[PDB]
Amino acid sequence: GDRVADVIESSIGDSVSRALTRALPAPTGQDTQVSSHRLDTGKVPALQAAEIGASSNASDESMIETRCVLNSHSTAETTLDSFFSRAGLVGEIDLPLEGTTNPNGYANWDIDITGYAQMRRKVELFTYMRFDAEFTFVACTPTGQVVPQLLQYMFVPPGAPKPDSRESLAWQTATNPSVFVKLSDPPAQVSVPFMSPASAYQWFYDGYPTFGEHKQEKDLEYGACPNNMMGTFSVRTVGTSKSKYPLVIRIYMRMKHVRAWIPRPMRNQNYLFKANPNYAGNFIKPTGASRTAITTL
């Protein structure tokens, strides 16, 4: 057993996370209390030290003479679900008749929300995000016309066989979930759970997925997180012959039940690649606009 003092009194095993702060309810903005002129020495709220790394806690009352204002402005709309639960474009699938991209009437879209800056800048604000997903698929011809075409959307989890043709055996969907809708119908809409092996999706993974030498050929593996590879999206025109109409499919994603961790600085450079923080080295532009002189507006 334990007989030595350094073991008996040891703090090893204390798994409680000492948290210096606790969350307090704040339905509305903080009220402003009455303040008066204050002329005293020794005590000084105005002078602070950003040196410490803590935001200055000086209030309005401690700097200027303020009145009593009952602030009833709600803080509900700035919450995570209010900010993120708005559907936005995350992927686009093109199904041309004659083309070089997908002339076979099917297309496999690797699920990733980094393909569009509007969504990417929002999601990339936090390092770790845990949420559900709601995907809506708006399909139409390039002219915006709706045509009587029947489509199949298949969810292909990682490891499942990827279809290789419009008549492939993988389309039997005996286990994979599939959605059969027509373009005349309203856009198909399904709810997707949190399927990551990790406890939260991580948009930035500062590491490598496998051991060994990372040479030039094995260099694209940096920044790729297998815990975010949620699978492939397979879409095809349901038929044996080629479809009569060209189709373009836009996939809109809307997060819900969102939880976020570890805020990081928001991107300020043009995006260049999916799952890659690369930026134009010679075209580094300032975050904000510039002015001719500092002493003038």
């Binding site: 040891s10 090893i12 095993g13 204390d14 798994s15 409680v16 996370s17 000492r18 948290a19 210096l20 702060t21 030290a49 950003a50 040196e51 410490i52 790394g53 803590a54 390092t127 770790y128 990790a198 406890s199 939260a200 999706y201 991580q202 930035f204 993974y205 500062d206 590491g207 490598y208 997925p209 051991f211 990372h214 260099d219 694209l220 940096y222 920044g223 815990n227 570890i262 805020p263 990081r264 600085p265 928001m266 991107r267 300020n268 450079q269 043009n270 995006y271 260049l272 690649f273 890659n276 923080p277 690369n278 930026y279 134009a280 080295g281 010679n282 075209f283 580094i284 300032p286 975050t287």
Partner: protein, 245 residues
């Protein structure tokens, strides 16, 4: 009562007479993994004092034209002492950290350092300048080791993120006029209870001079920046033969 401080852990002690308080990363002290959060079934090893000690890894010289430097964790200690030996012999890893940056000058020197801890600090390439080239940073840049790495474009932190918003992360300022040391205590920041200490870098420490160093000619021109750090509540699991990288 707030300017003098002494940090002792393991068999090492670090003192300071011009401190500027201590920042606890995200208001959370390092702690051992709870049994409701652990996923590995093997009993982890907790070497305690043999690894939870202050390591002085390298010294960088601050110059009037310096751009800044960054280090990756626990890469800096993957090859240092009993901690590095345990990280090599064990697959899993979990620890906090206590980073103490030393940068001392005289009352006639001026300059400001921004010392921040950015979790999952993924380094990007310049993409060939124009952005049409899909490059990736080399191994020596993504995992610089104990020497750190000098930033090429500190404004975007070589990752397309402005440094003006870097203060949202746990950070301290080394302004030579008042303080000569920055202390940041960082708990384990990951989406997993354990992770590989070699492949994955939990966070990166950035030391970027925002206000350039200056002094009249005649004063001491060598102003070194020394990084001292100590893992806290370190755990290891999944023992096998040692792996060097």
């Amino acid at each position: 009562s707030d300017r003098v401080a002494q940090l002792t852990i393991g068999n090492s002690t670090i003192t300071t007479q011009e401190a500027a308080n201590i920042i606890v990363g995200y208001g959370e002290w390092p702690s051992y993994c709870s049994d409701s959060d652990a996923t590995a079934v093997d009993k982890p090893t907790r070497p305690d004092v043999s690894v939870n000690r202050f390591y002085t890894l390298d010294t960088k010289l601050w110059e009037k034209s310096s751009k800044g430097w960054y280090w990756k964790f626990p890469d800096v200690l993957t090859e240092t002492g009993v901690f590095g030996q345990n990280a090599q012999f064990h697959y899993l890893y979990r620890s906090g950290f206590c980073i103490h940056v030393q940068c001392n000058a005289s009352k006639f020197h001026q300059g400001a350092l921004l010392v921040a801890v950015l979790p999952e600090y993924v380094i990007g390439s310049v993409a060939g300048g124009t952005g049409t080239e899909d490059t990736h940073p080399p191994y020596k840049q993504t995992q610089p080791g104990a020497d750190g790495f000098e930033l090429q474009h500190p404004y975007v932190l070589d990752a397309g993120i402005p440094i003006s918003q870097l203060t949202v992360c746990p950070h301290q300022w080394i302004n030579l006029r008042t303080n000569n040391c920055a202390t940041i205590i960082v708990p384990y920041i990951n989406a997993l209870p354990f992770d590989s200490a070699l492949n994955h870098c939990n966070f990166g420490l950035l030391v970027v001079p925002i206000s350039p160093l200056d002094y009249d000619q005649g004063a001491t021109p060598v102003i070194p920046i020394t990084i001292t750090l100590a893992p806290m509540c370190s755990e290891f699991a999944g023992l096998r033969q040692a792996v060097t990288q």
